[PDB]
Amino acid sequence: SAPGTLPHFIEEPEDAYIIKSNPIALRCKARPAMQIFFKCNGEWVHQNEHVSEESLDESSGLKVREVFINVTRQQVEDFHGPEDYWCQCVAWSHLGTSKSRKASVRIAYLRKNFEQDPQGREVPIEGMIVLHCRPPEGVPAAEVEWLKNEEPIDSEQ
Amino acid sequence: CPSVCRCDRNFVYCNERSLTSVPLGIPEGVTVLYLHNNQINNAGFPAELHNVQSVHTVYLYGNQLDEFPMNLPKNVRVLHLQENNIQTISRAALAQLLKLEELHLDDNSISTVGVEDGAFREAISLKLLFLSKNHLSSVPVGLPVDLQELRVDENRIAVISDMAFQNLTSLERLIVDGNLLTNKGIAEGTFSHLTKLKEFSIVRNSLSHPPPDLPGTHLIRLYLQDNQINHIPLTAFANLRKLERLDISNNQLRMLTQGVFDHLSNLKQLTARNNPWFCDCSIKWVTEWLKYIPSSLNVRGFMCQGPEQVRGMAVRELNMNLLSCP
Amino acid sequence: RELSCESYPIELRCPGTDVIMIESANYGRTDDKICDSDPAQMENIRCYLPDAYKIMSQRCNNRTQCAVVAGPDVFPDPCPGTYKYLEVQYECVPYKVEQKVFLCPGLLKGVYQSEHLFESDHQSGAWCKDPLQASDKIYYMPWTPYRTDTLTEYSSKDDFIAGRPTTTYKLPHRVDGTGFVVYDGALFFNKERTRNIVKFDLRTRIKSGEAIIANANYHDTSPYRWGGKSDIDLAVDENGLWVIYATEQNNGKIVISQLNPYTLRIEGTWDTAYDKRSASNAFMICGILYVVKSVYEDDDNEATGNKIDYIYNTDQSKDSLVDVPFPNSYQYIAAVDYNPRDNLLYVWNNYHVVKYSLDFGPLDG
Amino acid sequence: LCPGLLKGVYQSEHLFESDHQSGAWCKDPLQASDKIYYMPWTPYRTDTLTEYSSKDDFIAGRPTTTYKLPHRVDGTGFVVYDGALFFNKERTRNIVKFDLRTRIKSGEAIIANANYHDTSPYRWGGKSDIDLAVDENGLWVIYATEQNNGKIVISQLNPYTLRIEGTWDTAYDKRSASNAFMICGILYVVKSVYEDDDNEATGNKIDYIYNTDQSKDSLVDVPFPNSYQYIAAVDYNPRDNLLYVWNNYHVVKYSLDFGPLDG
Amino acid sequence: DENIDTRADHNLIIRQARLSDSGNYTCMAANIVAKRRSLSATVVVYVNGGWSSWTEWSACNVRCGRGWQKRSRTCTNPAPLNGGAFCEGMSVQKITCTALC
Ligand SMILES: *[C@@H]1O[C@H](CO)[C@@H](O)[C@H](O)[C@H]1NC(C)=O
Ligand SMILES: *[C@@H]1O[C@H](CO)[C@@H](O)[C@H](O)[C@H]1NC(C)=O
Ligand SMILES: *[C@@H]1O[C@H](CO)[C@@H](O)[C@H](O)[C@H]1NC(C)=O
Ligand SMILES: *[C@@H]1O[C@H](CO)[C@@H](O)[C@H](O)[C@H]1NC(C)=O
Ligand SMILES: [Ca+2]
Ligand SMILES: [Ca+2]
Ligand code: NA
Ligand code: NA
């Protein structure tokens, strides 16, 4: 009586970043699902590495499955492939299979020295000026915020 | 010749040109068609493409397909449909390409349920099938009778039925490695009806012992690595009188029973690095067998792990006549 | 001694006309209080790079002044998320240089048959010797379509003919074509169904890197006249490591690019006028490309071949049409590689494993 | 002093299983002491020597003192001669003399035309281009030159002046050999089968000898013991007439048999 | 064009990548002495992938019992351009159908 369809992803894996050698795991949620596995960097991840949790959500009628996989610093630093350490999620149903987002695990860092500091200018009352800023190298890309006299400025204001 | 696509002599180069469909202007003299690394969807296939009889090899890898394509060149022999999203295989599609001999379907999302009942049997001339790196849970039923090589490795196959390898007498190479396969998964003598089989491989699986009732009539190469093989029964390697290459390295073996390799007369190479070999009295026959062995046979990997007194030592040579064992 | 933190270029200079000589070099972290950065990046004080000496010797040695940018352009990253530095210990010695081995023999005048080892079980395959390491080791890889995944090592020439191997390497990926080469104890090969070059250290038996050759045609798209997934061909000469391939931008014509054996990056690209499928094979000598045009089994109303008909210089960026007779006893030419240490060609021609002798011009300009 | 010509090499003692796959260990034959000098081999990082008071302390892992060497060491050719350490300096064809008592470098000798830094090492490599030996005749240097076409070149070195007091060229290739040792001025070349060489099955025996006094060579067949496969270093001690062999991660001692077949 | 403007501190501002598309932009300084050309900047405008409208459901392959129905969703509205990001999610849709006999 229940409707039968391909697996639909709820919690797709999001890009992870390793900080101070603390291994951060990847989340995966799909419905309807009976088997959920990870395909990291082209090849399947071993069954033992997977931790399944067949928790039935109230909001949805069909069977929900949640699988978590730990990714260590040693795994990323010893991987010498062409692209960034990526992972994908494959879910099994009675009709077929479905792939998720490619979540890329990277080594998080940030530099002290700014690439280009803003330069001071003398401008008339009607004149226009642009203040340039190049943030330091780091993964992920740095979020630039402007401050007028050590207090933030609102662009929409 | 097309405008967007640049043809060169007896070849057509429509590769890496951001194309979503096959170009119209295709000559009737072309033999090889390149359409790989594009964005060609399963909907962008004209009927006129089927009419180009001269084409024998088509390359469509790294595209954005959902199903096996329709209206492909009639008299095609070799097809390259890999690194894309194929999930459905229809009987009508394979019925068009009768002359198809070599088929590669690597890295696709092919599932057991997605393939139509006896869809591969429609390609009567098929000999090479590559269902590698797909989303397979078991070996499909309706396989071609005159198939020579079935490469169904690197999936999620846990169970194999006896009827999966029916009428596949003509098969020579079977590669089922990198799967969730156990001894409970393999049916009572499923592989027995494959007389012409020469090479067999179940590496990186979960076998507690080698699969019983294996064909010996033509088998030359047998590979059983990274499995959890605790012990090998005596009957398992008998009636394989044609075997030359055997590998059992990266397994959970401690000791072997005397005369387990007595029927492997044609054996040229045996590999047994990384194994927890417990060297006691059960290895006395191993050392003696290694001494009277001919130059024809190379046996490597036999190294002790227990006890601490003989730890790391090679089973090739004994000291003080294996202590007080005989 | 000289020291410089990450992304900071280093400078080396000897007094007068004296030459720089590297003694010890390391790119990583041994001490945490020398450089000044974030304390999180300084937590790991055990980063090492052995290849540091090899890089410095190729650039600073046998020169008066030296400037090497301590970054990813010249040095590969050993430990990620760690602020590295370059520690170099150098001595000033006379301006003398070592001859013959590094030096160019000249312009190719004629190719002749030299040695015939044996007749292999495979029609196509590739064999070579490491020109950097002073050893009589022979590396053998007989090409089997959709099945090539092993590299065989032989102790000597006598063992290679007799078929007595030392060790066999189990590669992490399938190899495409007969283009492989060995550079300083590391194997460089084209990975199947990809425009990528894989670096595999034979000593450690692990993959060290994978480089993407931009716009390169792969997997029977633009191979040599015999096909067999020969799309990407690797070469070794006096100038260094090279990549012979083809792009659709050059309309199937041969594109030659110099590759760094440590950073695995393109250090220059050159486009030729010769079509790769029309070519039988190619080899590099002094940064000069030599295109082989040979005759094959099954050639309808054909006799034209067994010649070097095209040459391309990288330094001058100019091409010329030559006519150097090439030996082709058996028809199926599979692989042609040049070894700068012995100045001989490593050929595989229709099951036959052969070595070819070379003759050179009095000048090269 | 000479016991005679070597007949057979046999297993004697097994001390322990070290954490490193390669290295060397030896005792000073000149000084009448039970001191053991330990050397773990680490690529591009070898710079310390460990001294042990006795055999019991060496097995138990109880060290007396550790010496901080002035330069990085290349290969497993470590040798001790009358309270002074003789080692090969990294990326150079230079023996370095270091007095253990004063803890200072006393000299540095250049071994002429010698191949160095993985150019001509043993079968397993590991920068074993230059190997030092001690026997009844004195201090010796086992190496290879391009003049001899990679073949083994043996030279007697003075432990005081640090100069070559004679040079001999052999017919055996250094890379084809596993290790070598000197007894009564006679060189013994060991040929063995290593790990990850799963193609190999051949017997591990001594197949070459070279006399310095006679300047003549012969092809022998003395069986060499190999419980493990990674034979790192083989050194002879003239005081106890035993071999200081390092095979794989393990550290062993080998007993020696002698014959009176000498002029 | 209102989309492009020149600033007093020598800057070229583009609001929308539609009214001023890709190209090899080069900055040039002029003086009474002479003129000087700068290194050209490669400004490339990319179009990100967007899914196209759903198709019709196919007929049930099996006559009696459990059947199949398909619906395709291609990445052509808009189709990725100049190295734009590919479409996110699944391309095919399948539902079980029961045909009365
Ligand atoms: C591995 O993942 C599980 C959750 O699936 C977590 O509880 C466990 O702590 C992780 N392992 C480590 C070492 O953190
Ligand atoms: C398959 O083999 C069976 C016997 O096991 C035989 O009865 C059947 O006819 C064969 N199928 C075909 C198409 O011949
Ligand atoms: C350059 O310097 C290196 C460093 O030792 C040396 O080996 C080489 O012989 C010198 N000469 C040339 C031409 O490279
Ligand atoms: C800049 O782009 C133009 C085409 O718009 C091209 O012709 C020119 O060569 C390019 N210049 C560079 C340096 O890429
Ligand atoms: Ca070549
Ligand atoms: Ca020695
Ligand atoms: Na090659
Ligand atoms: Na020594």
| Three-state secondary structure readout of chain D | CCCCEEEEEEEEEEEEECCCCCEEEECCCCCCCCCEEEEECCCCCCCEEEEECCHHHHHHCCCCEEEECCCCECCCCCEECCCEEEECECCCCCCEEEECCCCEEEEECCCCCECCCCCCCECCECCCCCEEEECCCCEEEEEEECCCCCEEEEEEECCCCCCEEEEEEEEEECCCCCEEEEECCEEEEEECCCCCCCCCCCCCEEEEEEECCCCCEECCCEECCCCCCCEEEEEEECCCCEEEEEECCEEEEEEEEEECCCC
Question: Solving technique for this entry?
Answer: X-ray
* Distance between CA atoms of residues C128 and B62, nearest Å: 33
Query: B75 — phi, psi (to 5°)?
Result: -95, 50
* Residue D86: closest CA among D72, D99, D101: D99
C132 neighbors C57 (Cβ within 8 angstroms): no
* Residue C326: closest CA among C356, C349, C298, C306: C306
Distance from the first to the final alpha carbon of chain D: 14
* Distance between CA atoms of residues D168 and D154, nearest Å: 5
* Residue E69: closest CA among E81, E61, E79, E78: E61
C235 neighbors C282 (Cβ within 8 angstroms): yes
For residue C253, give the chain B residue with the closest CA.
Answer: B8
Which run of H or of E encompasses B289?
A: helix B284-291
Instruction: Using DSSP, state whether C16 is helix, strand or coil.
Output: coil
Token digits for A75?
Answer: 């795994």
Token digits for E39?
Answer: 């290194």
Pick among A15, A90, A93, A98 to test the E interface (most E CBs inside 10 A): A98
Strand ranges, E, within chain B: 6-8, 11-13, 32-34, 57-59, 78-80, 102-104, 128-130, 149-151, 173-175, 199-201, 221-223, 245-247, 269-271, 277-278, 298-300, 304-306
CA-derived radius of gyration, chain E: 26
Measured between CB atoms, does B6 come within 8 Å of chain C? yes
Ligand nearest the Cα of residue D92 is: 3
**β-pair type (B304-306, B277-278):** parallel
| Atom 4 of ligand 2: nearest residue by CA position | B167
C289 neighbors C256 (Cβ within 8 angstroms): yes
Distance from the first to the final alpha carbon of chain B: 82
Residue C224 pairs with which residues in a beta bridge?
C227
B43 chain-E contacts, CB cut-off 8 A = 72, 74
Which amino acids bring their CB within 6 angstroms of ligand 2? B 145, 166-167
C28 neighbors C47 (Cβ within 8 angstroms): yes
* Distance between CA atoms of residues C193 and C229, nearest Å: 9
Distance from the first to the final alpha carbon of chain C: 39
b vs e for E34-71, b when ≥16 Cβ sit within 10 Å of the residue's Cβ? eeeeeeeeeeeeeeebebbeeeeeeebbeeeeebbebe
Which residues sit with Cβ closer than 5 angstroms to ligand 8, an ion?
A: D 77-79, 132, 235
Instruction: Using DSSP, state whether A75 is helix, strand or coil.
Output: helix
Question: Under 8 Å CB-to-CB from B144, ≥6 apart: which residues?
Answer: B120, B121, B123, B124, B126, B127, B129
* Distance between CA atoms of residues C353 and C334, nearest Å: 10
Task: Output the CA A49–ligand 1 centroid distance in Å.
Answer: 9
Which run of H or of E encompasses C135?
A: none
Helices (H) and strands (E) in chain A, counts: 1, 13
* Distance between CA atoms of residues C252 and C250, nearest Å: 6
* Residue D172: closest CA among D228, D123, D240, D233: D123
Query: B166 — phi, psi (to 5°)?
Result: -100, 140
C229 neighbors C223 (Cβ within 8 angstroms): yes
* Distance between CA atoms of residues B32 and C117, nearest Å: 37
**What does the angle CA D147 – CA D148 – CA D151 come to, to the nearest 5 degrees?**
140
CB contact under 8 A, D196 and C50: no
Measured between CB atoms, does A130 come within 8 Å of chain E? yes
All domains in chain C, ordered by first residue: 1-101 (2.60.120.740), 102-365 (no CATH)
C151 neighbors C136 (Cβ within 8 angstroms): no
* Distance between CA atoms of residues D187 and D214, nearest Å: 12
**What does the angle CA D160 – CA D163 – CA D166 come to, to the nearest 5 degrees?**
120
* Distance between CA atoms of residues C71 and C85, nearest Å: 9
* Residue C315: closest CA among C249, C365, C252: C365
Question: Under 8 Å CB-to-CB from C28, ≥6 apart: which residues?
Answer: C47, C48, C49, C78, C79, C82, C84, C85
Strand ranges, E, within C276-364: 281-285, 288-293, 307-313, 319-320, 324-325, 333-339, 344-349, 352-360
Strand ranges, E, within C138-287: 138-141, 150-154, 167-170, 181-182, 186-190, 196-201, 206-212, 233-236, 241-246, 253-259, 266-275, 281-285
Q: Is the omega angle on the peptide bond into residue C362 within 30 degrees of 0, that is, cis?
A: no
For chains A and B, having 3+ Cβ pairs within 8 Å is answered yes
Token digits for C194?
Answer: 């990809």
For residue E89, give the chain B residue with the closest CA.
Answer: B85
CB contact under 8 A, C221 and B15: yes
Question: Under 8 Å CB-to-CB from C299, ≥6 apart: which residues?
Answer: C305
- CA torsion angle A29 A32 A36 A39 (round to 10): -80
* Residue C140: closest CA among C132, B114, C131, C124: C124
B183 neighbors B163 (Cβ within 8 angstroms): no
Measured between CB atoms, does E6 come within 8 Å of chain A? no
Q: Which homologous superfamily is B1-326 in?
A: Ribonuclease Inhibitor (3.80.10.10)
B56 neighbors B35 (Cβ within 8 angstroms): no
Token digits for B106?
Answer: 């690597």
* Distance between CA atoms of residues E43 and C306, nearest Å: 48
Question: At B206, which amino acid appears?
Answer: S
Q: Is E24 in the pocket of ligand 4 (CB under 6 A)?
A: yes
What is the CA C97 to chain-centroid distance, rounded? 23
Question: Under 8 Å CB-to-CB from A104, ≥6 apart: which residues?
Answer: A15, A16, A84, A85, A86, A87
- Helix, strand, coil % over all residues of chain C, rounded to 5: 5, 45, 55
Token digits for E81?
Answer: 């351009």
* Distance between CA atoms of residues C277 and D226, nearest Å: 53
Measured between CB atoms, does A14 come within 8 Å of chain C? no
DSSP state of B67: B
Looking up tokens 């929308």, which residue turns up? E16
* Distance between CA atoms of residues C364 and B174, nearest Å: 56
D161 neighbors D172 (Cβ within 8 angstroms): no
Pick among A37, A44, A93, A99 to test the B interface (most B CBs inside 10 A): A44
* Residue B249: closest CA among B222, B276, B268, B274: B274
Question: Under 8 Å CB-to-CB from B203, ≥6 apart: which residues?
Answer: B177, B178, B223, B224, B225, B226, B227
Q: Is A70 in the pocket of ligand 1 (CB under 6 A)?
A: yes
* Distance between CA atoms of residues A62 and A65, nearest Å: 10
A88 chain-E contacts, CB cut-off 8 A = none
Task: Output the CA A68–ligand 1 centroid distance in Å.
Answer: 8
DSSP state of B162: G
* Distance between CA atoms of residues D175 and D181, nearest Å: 15
* Distance between CA atoms of residues D232 and D190, nearest Å: 12
Question: Under 8 Å CB-to-CB from A108, ≥6 apart: which residues?
Answer: A17, A18, A19, A138, A139, A140, C81
Instruction: Using DSSP, state whether C157 is helix, strand or coil.
Output: helix
* Distance between CA atoms of residues A135 and A109, nearest Å: 13
DSSP state of C30: S
Listing from the earlier edge strand, what are the strands of the sheet with C206-212? Answer: C181-182, C186-190, C196-201, C206-212
Instruction: Give, in order, the Cα–Cα distances in Å from A135 to each of A110, A121, C35, C38, D23.
Output: 10, 20, 21, 16, 49
* Distance between CA atoms of residues D28 and D22, nearest Å: 21
Question: At C344, which amino acid appears?
Answer: L
Measured between CB atoms, does E3 come within 8 Å of chain B? no
Token digits for B120?
Answer: 């591969």
**Which residue from C61, C95, C102 has its CB within 8 A of the most atoms of ligand 3, so it is best to mutate?**
C61
Looking up tokens 């309706």, which residue turns up? B142
Cβ-in-10-Å burial (0-12, 13-18, 19+) of D52 comes to: buried
Resolution in A: 3.4
- Say if residue D233 carries a ligand binding annotation: no
Distance from the first to the final alpha carbon of chain A: 56
Q: Is A53 in the pocket of ligand 1 (CB under 6 A)?
A: no
